[PDB]
Amino acid sequence: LSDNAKTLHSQMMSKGIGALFTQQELQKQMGIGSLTDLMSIVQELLDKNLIKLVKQNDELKFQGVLESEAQKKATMSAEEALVYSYIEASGREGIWSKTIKARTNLHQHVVLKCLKSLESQRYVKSVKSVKFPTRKIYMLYSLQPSVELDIEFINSLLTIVWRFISENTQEILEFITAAQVANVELTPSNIRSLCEVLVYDDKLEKVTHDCYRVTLESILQMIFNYFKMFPASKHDKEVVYFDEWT
Amino acid sequence: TAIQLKLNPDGTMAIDEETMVVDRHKNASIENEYKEKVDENPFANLYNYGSYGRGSYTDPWTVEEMIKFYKALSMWGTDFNLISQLYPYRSRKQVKAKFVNEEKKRPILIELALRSKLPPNFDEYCCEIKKNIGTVADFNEKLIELQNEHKHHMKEIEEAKNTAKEEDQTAQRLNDAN
Amino acid sequence: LESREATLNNARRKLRAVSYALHIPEYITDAAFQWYKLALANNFVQGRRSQNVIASCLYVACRKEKTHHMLIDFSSRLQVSVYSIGATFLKMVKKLHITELPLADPSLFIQHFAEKLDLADKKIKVVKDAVKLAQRMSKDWMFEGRRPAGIAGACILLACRMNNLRRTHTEIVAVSHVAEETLQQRLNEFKNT
DNA sequence: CACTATTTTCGGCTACTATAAATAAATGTTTTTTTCGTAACCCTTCGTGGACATTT
DNA sequence: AAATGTCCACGAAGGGTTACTGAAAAAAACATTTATTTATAGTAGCCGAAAATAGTG
């Protein structure tokens, strides 16, 4: 009875967590008992809340988890364990507090009181998203925020690449790695997207599908001469405006 | 109250439709059933000014507890922190109300408690240890060693956390190059 | 503001909530709102409980009318102490410069006790004898720092004493909501003046 | 008639209830922004004939 | 050179259609509670003893 369960979860511990298990291999793995008694101890082990019911698509599938985090969730009462189960089932991308309220039928107070107790027990952290901001996304402490950075100081590096070319795309990477650049990740896919910005300002030019020249706007940096045209603007009536015809 | 399954001869290893979700009321229902059933007469729920308020009635003090009090007030100066546990289900507030009480009725024994600044009749050595026999352990450093265990368990957690931080950095770089 | 309109549309449901309950007629709810409205602007509603300020605001309007309603009939619905809601009443009146005010006249409370007490159909002689007892109680020296509902809860005991056997010290306490032994002290007091 | 006994009563014990000050910090509690019926008649469709180009 | 197929356009026919008798969160603001402590008086639970008279044999 219980000794065969000690042999059952050894097989669940035998393989590293991936390559998820199912019965048609597990019956060939363990066939000392007939299926009239194989199912009974697994349903007893569902009552010992160590085996879970994973879904591989359209068909029947199992997964056995670690015991060290099984007693972690058995500390909770069944409602706190109910919200905990969905919030690890997302795992890699997080869950929204409206979606975690819909799938459980728990109304607005009883879910907001549930996770507030769960956060003190160090079992949920709160991150804000960038693909949709102003939305509360929760995760575990696995720290998987798969969702460069949206806040400014983009152009603080684009002045560096434009001073670099003005003297006259793979070479562009290694100039950025030096010179105390506050960076964390460079790739040619990014630097092309970093280069298309100054294509639109006409501060550099695209030639031969990868080469880049200066458009000589350095001489404008220093009729098409839009500085050194200072207006009168004071006590003058006959001045030309761009609006005020619409 | 976990998920249950069954062995159908037609569909083997099938999952049942009803235990998929829980009612959350049937376990509340049986809790209610062995409760007292009272027929309300409108004169029972009478309320006055002494209703929905603080406080209770303290048990009037005994001469047995006087010799546990004045000796605690002769050795210590006036230390209500440890007298509160000496009287196991009495509280910090009414022993302070007893302190102001005994000033007015017996104004001379609080002087004798103040005047005596010396070892008394040395019978309190058992009463020294009568407090010290409950859960005998060296609290001066036994509080330290399990607190050391508390930060030792935390020192596991960042190691379990920060190695879980670096597994994110290797996978999210791998699909970038892919 | 829209948020300032929305904080009184909600606060209009509160005053109509208790006035439907205590049978406050509709010319007091509308009179009560301006007392809430001036206390709204002068930074009195911030911090304190919403449901704790509106009953204290309503009692100002019920005192000015000189009506039979006490203060503890507000608090017993709210299941707090009398002294909790009474303390935020004192910080309303002296802060917001309410100088003129009616006194808690105990002769008002005799006429309203009888109707839900369900006494005999000769309900005038229990009243005509009682206010003449209260006028006798008025010149005599017992109620000056005592309770308006207290001394008016033992007169109608003694006025109905000589005619009925309604005195059992429990059906009158279920009306007056003042303790059983604090009116026997009143009956011991006036006997010996 | 003797005392038992709930009733009647004294009685004191207790415990805040306001009223003014020091912080100081913790706590909750509630607003103001910041954001997520007949009859024309246009309309729509099925359709039929004209000419152009390749091919016999 | 002619004959057939194909591309195109226009009227023919019915089709339907229109005025007729809010909540959520965040920074903001702020009273409350906690800690005294010092007098007074009533409200009240509360026992509690204890006076006392109602009452049992």
UniProtKB/Swiss-Prot annotation, chain A:
Its main location: nucleus. DNA-dependent RNA polymerase catalyzes the transcription of DNA into RNA using the four ribonucleoside triphosphates as substrates. Specific peripheric component of RNA polymerase III which synthesizes small RNAs, such as 5S rRNA and tRNAs. Involved in recruitment of Pol III to the preinitiation complex. Involved in the configuration of an initiation-competent form of RNA polymerase. Keywords: DNA-directed RNA polymerase, Nucleus, Transcription. It holds the Pfam family RNA_pol_Rpc34. This is DNA-directed RNA polymerase III subunit RPC6. InterPro entries: RNA_pol_Rpc34 (IPR007832), RNA_pol_Rpc34-like (IPR016049), WH-like_DNA-bd_sf (IPR036388), WH_DNA-bd_sf (IPR036390). Gene3D superfamilies: Winged helix-like DNA-binding domain superfamily/Winged helix DNA-binding domain (1.10.10.10). GO terms for cellular component: cytoplasm; mitochondrion; nucleoplasm; nucleus; RNA polymerase III complex. Belongs to the eukaryotic RPC34/RPC39 RNA polymerase subunit family. It comes from the Eukaryota. PANTHER family: RNA POLYMERASE III DNA DIRECTED , 39KD SUBUNIT-RELATED. GO terms for biological process: termination of RNA polymerase III transcription; transcription by RNA polymerase III; transcription initiation at RNA polymerase III promoter; tRNA transcription by RNA polymerase III. Component of the RNA polymerase III (Pol III) complex consisting of 17 subunits. Interacts with BRF1/TDS4. It is found in: Nucleus.
From Swiss-Prot, chain B:
It comes from Saccharomyces cerevisiae (strain ATCC 204508 / S288c). Residues 161-170 have a biased composition (Basic and acidic residues). This is Transcription factor TFIIIB component B''. It comes from the Eukaryota. TFIIIB comprises the TATA-binding protein (TBP), the B-related factor (BRF) and the B'' component (BDP1). Interacts with TFC4. General activator of RNA polymerase III transcription. The chain holds residues 360 to 537 of 594 of the full protein. Residues 161-178 are annotated as: Disordered. It is found in: Nucleus. Residues 56-107 form the SANT domain. Belongs to the TFC5 family.
From Swiss-Prot, chain C:
The keyword Disulfide bond does not apply. GO terms for biological process: DNA-templated transcription initiation; DNA-templated transcription open complex formation; regulation of transcription by RNA polymerase III; RNA polymerase III preinitiation complex assembly; transcription by RNA polymerase III. Keywords: Activator, Metal-binding, Nucleus, Phosphoprotein, Repeat, Transcription, Transcription regulation, Zinc, Zinc-finger. It is found in: Nucleus. GO terms for cellular component: nucleoplasm; nucleus; transcription factor TFIIIB complex; transcription preinitiation complex. GO terms for molecular function: DNA binding; RNA polymerase III core binding; RNA polymerase III general transcription initiation factor activity; RNA polymerase III type 3 promoter sequence-specific DNA binding; TBP-class protein binding; TFIIIC-class transcription factor complex binding; zinc ion binding. The keyword Mitochondrion does not apply. Sequence repeats lie at residues 18-94, 113-192. General activator of RNA polymerase III transcription. Interacts with TBP. Binds to Pol III subunit C34 and to the TAU135 component of TFIIIC. TFIIIB comprises the TATA-binding protein (TBP), the B-related factor (BRF) and the B' component (TFC5). Belongs to the TFIIB family. This is Transcription factor IIIB 70 kDa subunit. It comes from Saccharomyces cerevisiae (strain ATCC 204508 / S288c) (Baker's yeast). The chain holds residues 73 to 265 of 596 of the full protein.
